[PDB]
Design an enzyme around this catalytic site. Structure first.
Site, PDB file in Angstrom:
ATOM      1  CD  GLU A  43      -2.800   1.159   2.469  1.00  0.00           C
ATOM      2  OE1 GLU A  43      -2.442   0.554   3.503  1.00  0.00           O
ATOM      3  OE2 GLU A  43      -3.900   1.748   2.394  1.00  0.00           O
ATOM      4  CE  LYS A 112      -7.161   1.131   2.801  1.00  0.00           C
ATOM      5  NZ  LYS A 112      -6.034   1.425   3.723  1.00  0.00           N
ATOM      6  CB  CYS A 173      -4.642  -2.262   3.831  1.00  0.00           C
ATOM      7  SG  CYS A 173      -3.521  -2.609   5.198  1.00  0.00           S
ATOM      8  CB  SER A 355      20.777   0.092  35.122  1.00  0.00           C
ATOM      9  OG  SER A 355      19.975  -1.071  35.097  1.00  0.00           O
TER      10      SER A 355
END
Ligand SMILES: Nc1ncnc2c1ncn2[C@@H]1O[C@H](COP(=O)(O)OP(=O)(O)OC[C@H]2O[C@@H]([n+]3cccc(C(=O)O)c3)[C@H](O)[C@@H]2O)[C@@H](O)[C@H]1O
Ligand SMILES: Nc1ncnc2c1ncn2[C@@H]1O[C@H](COP(=O)(O)OP(=O)(O)OC[C@H]2O[C@@H]([n+]3cccc(C(=O)O)c3)[C@H](O)[C@@H]2O)[C@@H](O)[C@H]1O
Ligand SMILES: Nc1ncnc2c1ncn2[C@@H]1O[C@H](COP(=O)(O)O)[C@@H](O)[C@H]1O
Ligand SMILES: Nc1ncnc2c1ncn2[C@@H]1O[C@H](COP(=O)(O)O)[C@@H](O)[C@H]1O
Ligand SMILES: [Cl-]
Ligand SMILES: [Cl-]
Ligand SMILES: [Cl-]
Ligand SMILES: [Cl-]
Ligand SMILES: [Cl-]
Ligand SMILES: [Cl-]
Ligand SMILES: [Cl-]
Ligand SMILES: [Cl-]
Ligand SMILES: [Cl-]
Ligand SMILES: [Cl-]
Ligand SMILES: [Cl-]
Ligand SMILES: [Mg+2]
Ligand SMILES: [Mg+2]
Lengths: 696, 696, 351
Positions: A43, A112, A173, A355
């Protein structure tokens, strides 16, 4: 009969037209070498899916077309149908489109019809859905394209292609899972191949729903289904995980990578169309409920998808989709993310405040994993990756084989001990660095801290004390925070000058180590080491982090992690009085990471405010807690949350992984100045409690 | 004949239902006491406009109704028609609604038919537009409402209200700005009064557009038009600037405040319906179209807008809208936005780093302005302001009269000099503080800087040098940045401990001083004082800032400012070798604040990528610059912009002022990992330049 | 909040009204003993699904109604919503319907909209699909039913029930797998419970596709799904294998027998409706593609599906569907078939 089609995953980059073009070309050249007569791309692949507000810009539209022209005049695209994506403005309205061309002609532009407007998606900001279903309009081409293509107009809208041998249709999509999806009517109409171009980003554990869907769809309606997707980082906090696939009649024939360091991955498959036709006969060769709906418009295309190759062309056999474990998912995504970030930032490496605790460790593991992937890739003959490593480290002849070697050149870990740090944590950090290969720095902040508190005293005449030295709650906190922030100041200094101090050009990206759980409760110091440049574990759950680190022990052979896991999760910033030991973060927060995760998910996933959440847990934890008790837990959660939200506005950008992120820039839009007593809501909660406490 | 109507501006607060309820009640009570039989509120006023993703939460819906039920059973609302806003779920679709009730009966629920999806707005994320024009469905009421109202259902949709004497229509906010607005067809179908509930935020200079539009509309269409709006900060960067109005037949009858410290401000006007009717009766083309106009559904209401008030009830006379100068706007907007933060954050005051330069100066002036405003408000009899102050200051007897005395209680300026700072800048800061009455802190950061650098030397065996001492470009920058972040460390230390040192409870909000121009270019140090809690001027142009400050000299009687204005804009962080004078930030940026302001407006407001921008400038600066030159200017801008965009992701939330804000959380979404060479786009530019050099 | 619903498999017999009635009654009595407030039965259960050309006969219609009346006046049906199936002729057109009643009132008659016309199915021979989607018409009741029910007309068509606490919708047999199924729009509209009355016959090895479908549907759209089916031989060469089920949000909560010698098998489940509401929020709490379609008509029903039982009522836990091996399928179906054949033929045995 037999056809050969290609789909693909591309590592596209927002507005990176030059690169985007070359990637598209490469996939087409690959598909053609494999015998494909149709190629499907992701897309909006021409401009890259993540251009955001650049879509408002006309230049975007323009260059996209200049890129399209380049594709059209390219001799590689000959005799293959190419379905690319770009934005396109028709009659002053901007649509997210598929442009399908063949031999220097545009066949159809297909916009779309359902737009994503949830979570990280906000397509309605820039695009309009096509609303004239089963209809087309004449799109007028740019003179740029006219001259090249020799066409005045092309069909624009909801249509299908009909070739001499087949019928191909488009599903973009999210149209795949939108109520009343194109694939239903396309099926009914006799569309044998359906292409879906995606731009969906990674989400921990949800890879199977994509596969299941395509599977079920082909199972239920028959047909070949093609899915293409962007893969990699396109310039922001998302990782697209292209699980491009080829499915037919309910089985999978090609499985694309979720995470890899490839810029271009092409899937092909050789399928007999008659299998579709005979599989559909198998179901309903009859008629349906008598629908009489407007049928799909048809673009005639003078082309045969199947061409003589049959005599040699092996039919693709079905395959089983292999998933990654959640820990494998974690070790790969953020990892491949960090690789694109490093390579596209043109930065000299990373700087990681380590750490000796779990999260900083996980972060270290992600880098090591990255290195491994790069080594794997280079071994595999990946020229792009080799080129990039060579460019990042500046050594033309370099060739990463040992991951510890690459790591050393790319990662700088930094342990910054205060007056109250234990020898144990210092050790663990030293060991983990030794094991992964990083350039380790160990220093003490206390001289800088003394100096700051000196400036304070000098000017106010007052000396703050730690809680254990009789200091107030406020003094204690302030002191702790100063150390936290001095660490940040120092981290950036090394980011900016450590390579310099080692005689070498360039600077480092500072990496952060906040986890999604503490980010939500705001249990962090504003502008301490929680704010860096990028945070790869920002969206991952604490439990998953522990899970991931324990998995790293055996996969990466790093024994240093065991002690790190076994060690008590304590922040050594304040001196300990006699008779007591350090307080753990979970006691500090006033809730376990477990229960914190539940609040997180009930809040963002299940969309519950305090009252709703009180009601849910009241039942969930009915045995364990009493009504008054859950009220307190919930109330404590919402207050701490609301009080601290402002910390979220300025927080380092994080790899997206959990769909319950509190991230404020894109995924979780919220106020930041709340009334933190929640008077109304909390009153409702009380009333319910009072009502229940009237039972015998 | 004559009807008395009310509209208002409420300082609503996201999810502050208790508070929001009380303010609505107050408006209705104020309305009734002034004789109105109709009361219109602002957009989504029950929940507060800016709940963002809490709109997804059922709890928002539920609690909204509980508020509504409260309004319905409230004596105060007897015999006045109330237009109130909340979100409503109807048939499992979520709408932005007006709910109109009278005497414990819901008359109609009117859903929004056009949503705002641009800028800071994104209603489509959580709501759906009602799209059946002039159509109505049955809304099934919640049981709770049924038991109270004894209604089973009420009309839901595009309907108007018919009383004995008149016809009332709703236009919701952005519907007024759509091409085919409801007021057109409404006025043709005989709606006399149109009500508009908005929730639109401040934008410098744009106030007249709202006024001109409503005026134009009632001028062209006839009729009375009421506008309501939120006023103040509801929990985020925006300030709603309630210019609530009443207009009829092209004239204004009541003008509401744009910025004021009032929670509830009600406008009423008494108008003659006969004036509407005869105004319309005089437009032949209108009447020709009105005798052919499509009809609206009408809800019949057993009520009279015009009662036995007629007895000499004085008709409202036309007024001229009085505007604020751009400097007054700046003086008043962020000031009120600041008051709202202070009181709603329940914090004890502000900490302002004060550098002795224009912007920090401006920020100081805003706080002083606020202080005056508070003093003015108290002198007015404003009981909530007086309460709010006493709460902040913890002294129930306190009465702020002098602006300088209040200022010293809630503001703490902080001058932080380096080794290279000049005595002048110190004294300017000090003199400004004296003059506005702030508690001023003066210190030197050098001890802390030396300590941090000493740490670095101890561990690397190397010592960075300033450029004047032969240091490299990077060393010089690293050194400057260190000092900068140290200032931030200190800022937060004083924010957290300064009151404590003065023997006083509470903490302070740190103010930022980044302007919108530097934010854009990234000309700031990541996590230096650019990183604070809120930045009241982060959305304001450098030129406006100077203008503002110069305005403050006469307005607030602050002479220290003149030197501040006249002094060279330089950042004293590096020593200068002699033979050379200090570099101004304008030569540091490589462009003037003016040309920068143009890039920023062309960028966001004209939606321009680098090719487009080059084209526009080429023509604009055709006399001043050559095409080669213009290309360099544009490339340099875009280059710098994109290398620095990441600084936006973690930057302090700023009061929204300009519509060219580069703010990344809401208004200007963009990627943050760009390909900073912009190959494609810069290629296009160089092509044009070559083309222009060959011809002529 | 918590509701208790029942679905069932019945061994119905074509035109065997007496027996068919007694079976329906028994299931309702069983559901009520188990605390159900809604009961779902199989497709055309009043007359038996397999009446074939007897559907052309008006007597079929008549007796069905006489059976319906008997149900309506029966004290067992009190305080439970009952969804039975019969043929019904509206305006001279014959429809395959659901008749939903509560406390001696008909709430809604809901006609089938997709008809099975493949293989052993030929519903178009006797029935017409309802073609006026999202619309209802006034059905005029038989005086027989009027006198009993005291209603002149009832809604006939594509509608949903709204109660004080929930929204229930209908999907008849094959509408479940017909393109553009009711369950999509019902979901969108906010229907929390969807009942499907089936009459599907055994087919070797294809039992899982039914289960998968219901599963996927509830997974994809959220919601409770109820499926009821005839079980046994109804007078011909088919064996109906009622795998009646109760599914919610993608999981199964009750699994009915495929082959058994029971004339009546009732499934119940106690489910919290808020699980639906929070599972749907989990997916899309937003808006959709902007559809603006004609929405479902709503029958208001003065009834609460959940009633005070919560204080004791255990929530049903999810279960895994157990399938029969193909050999087990063979050893059970034809077997149960032969049993009904023997017992209903009134024959002395086999040779
Ligand atoms: N509504 C609002 N809108 C905007 N700003 C608001 C605000 N409310 C407060 N603020 C301001 O925000 C600022 C908050 O920052 P600051 O004053 O530094 O303090 P803050 O960050 O709120 O406190 C730090 C927290 O970190 C925890 N901690 C301690 C030690 C180690 C670690 C670790 O795991 O690393 C964590 C500690 O328990 C403490 O709760 C304050 O100046 C406050 O005035
Ligand atoms: N694409 C990308 N995505 C994410 N992160 C990226 C990145 N590219 C670089 N980065 C990283 O971001 C970090 C940038 O921060 P840092 O290294 O400190 O340096 P940085 O903030 O980039 O430089 C500060 C600027 O401020 C100016 N300055 C100087 C003196 C006073 C003032 C003033 O007016 O107050 C301003 C100075 O001219 C300089 O250009 C670096 O670590 C870099 O590696
Ligand atoms: N001793 C340390 N050395 C390096 N980084 C640290 C250290 N302690 C904390 N951090 C950083 O600060 C954050 C955790 O805070 P704390 O929980 O107080 O250790 C993470 O972003 C760590 O990378
Ligand atoms: N000498 C100073 N004293 C207090 N704040 C300063 C000082 N210099 C810079 N700042 C802060 O740093 C930013 C401006 O950076 P600079 O241009 O280097 O002065 C603003 O946010 C100021 O509030
Ligand atoms: Cl053109
Ligand atoms: Cl056609
Ligand atoms: Cl360099
Ligand atoms: Cl830990
Ligand atoms: Cl831990
Ligand atoms: Cl240099
Ligand atoms: Cl305190
Ligand atoms: Cl200045
Ligand atoms: Cl200046
Ligand atoms: Cl009759
Ligand atoms: Cl209706
Ligand atoms: Mg840890
Ligand atoms: Mg300045």
């Amino acid at each position: 009969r037999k056809v050969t089609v290609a789909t693909c995953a591309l590592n596209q980059w927002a507005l990176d037209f030059e690169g985007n073009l070359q990637r598209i070309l490469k996939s087409i050249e690959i598909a053609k070498n494999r015998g494909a007569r149709y190629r499907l791309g992701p897309e909006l692949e021409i401009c890259g899916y993540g251009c955001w507000d650049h879509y408002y810009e006309s230049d975007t539209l323009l260059h996209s077309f200049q890129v399209l022209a380049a594709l059209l005049e390219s001799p590689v695209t000959q005799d293959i149908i190419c379905d690319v994506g770009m934005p396109v403005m028709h009659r002053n309205v901007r649509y997210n489109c598929r442009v399908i061309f063949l031999n220097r002609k545009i066949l159809l532009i297909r916009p779309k019809m359902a737009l994503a407007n949830e979570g990280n998606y906000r397509e309605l900001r820039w695009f309009t859905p096509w609303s004239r279903s089963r209809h087309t309009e004449e799109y007028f081409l740019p003179r740029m394209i006219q001259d090249l293509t020799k066409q005045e107009t092309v069909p624009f809208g909801d249509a299908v292609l009909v070739t001499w041998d087949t019928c191909i249709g488009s599903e973009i999509c999210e149209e795949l899972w939108t109520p009343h999806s194109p694939h239903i009517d396309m099926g009914l109409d006799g569309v044998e191949i359906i292409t879906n171009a995606s731009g969906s980003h990674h989400v921990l554990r949800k890879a199977n729903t994509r596969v299941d869907l395509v599977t079920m769809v082909t199972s239920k309606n028959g047909g070949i289904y093609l899915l293409a997707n962007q893969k990699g980082c396109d310039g922001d906090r998302l990782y697209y995980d292209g699980c491009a696939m080829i499915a037919m009649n309910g089985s999978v024939f090609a499985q694309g990578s979720q995470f890899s360091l490839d810029d271009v991955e092409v899937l092909t498959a050789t399928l007999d169309l008659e299998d579709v036709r005979s599989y559909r006969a198998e179901i309903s060769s009859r008629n349906l409920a008598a629908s009489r709906a407007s049928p799909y418009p048809r673009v005639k295309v003078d082309f045969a998808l199947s061409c003589h190759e049959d005599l040699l062309a092996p039919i693709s056999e079905p395959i089983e989709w292999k998933y990654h474990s959640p820990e494998e998912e974690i070790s790969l995504g953020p990892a491949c993310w960090l690789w694109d970030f490093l390579r596209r930032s043109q930065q000299a490496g990373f700087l990681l405040p380590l750490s000796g605790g779990v999260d900083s460790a996980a972060t270290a593991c992600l880098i090591y994993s990255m290195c491994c992937q790069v080594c794997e890739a280079v071994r595999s003959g990946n020229e792009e990756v080799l080129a990039d490593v060579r460019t990042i480290v500046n050594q033309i002849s370099y060739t990463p084989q040992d991951p510890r070697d690459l790591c050393g050149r790319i990662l700088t870990t930094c342990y910054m001990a205060s007056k109250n740090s234990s020898q144990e944590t210092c050790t663990r950090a030293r060991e983990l660095a030794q094991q992964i290969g990083s350039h380790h720095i160990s220093l003490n902040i206390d001289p800088a801290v003394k100096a700051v508190m000196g400036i304070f005293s000098l000017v106010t005449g007052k000396s703050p004390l730690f809680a254990a030295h009789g200091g107030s709650s406020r003094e204690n906190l302030a002191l702790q925070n100063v150390q936290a922030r001095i660490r940040m100041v120092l981290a950036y200094l090394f980011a900016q000058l450590s390579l310099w101090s080692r005689g070498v050009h360039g600077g480092l990206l500072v990496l952060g180590s906040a986890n999604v759980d503490e980010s939500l409760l705001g249990y962090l110091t504003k502008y301490d080491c929680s704010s860096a440049d990028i945070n790869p574990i920002g969206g991952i759950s604490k439990t998953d982090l522990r899970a991931f680190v324990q998995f790293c022990i055996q996969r990466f052979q790093l024994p240093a992690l065991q002690s790190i896991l076994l060690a008590p999760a304590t922040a050594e910033l304040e001196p300990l009085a006699d008779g007591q030991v350090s307080q753990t973060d979970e006691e500090d927060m006033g809730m376990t990471y477990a229960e914190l995760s539940v609040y997180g998910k009930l809040r963002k996933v299940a969309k519950m405010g305090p009252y709703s959440m009180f009601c849910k847990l009241l039942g969930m934890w009915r045995h364990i807690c009493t009504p008054r008790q859950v009220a307190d837990k919930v109330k404590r959660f919402f207050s701490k949350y609301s009080m601290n939200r402002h910390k979220m506005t300025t927080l380092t950008p994080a790899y997206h992984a959990e769909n319950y992120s509190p991230e404020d820039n894109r995924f979780d839009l919220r106020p930041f100045l709340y009334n933190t007593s929640w008077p109304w809501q909390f009153r409702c909660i009380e009333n319910q409690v009072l009502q229940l406490e009237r039972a015998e």
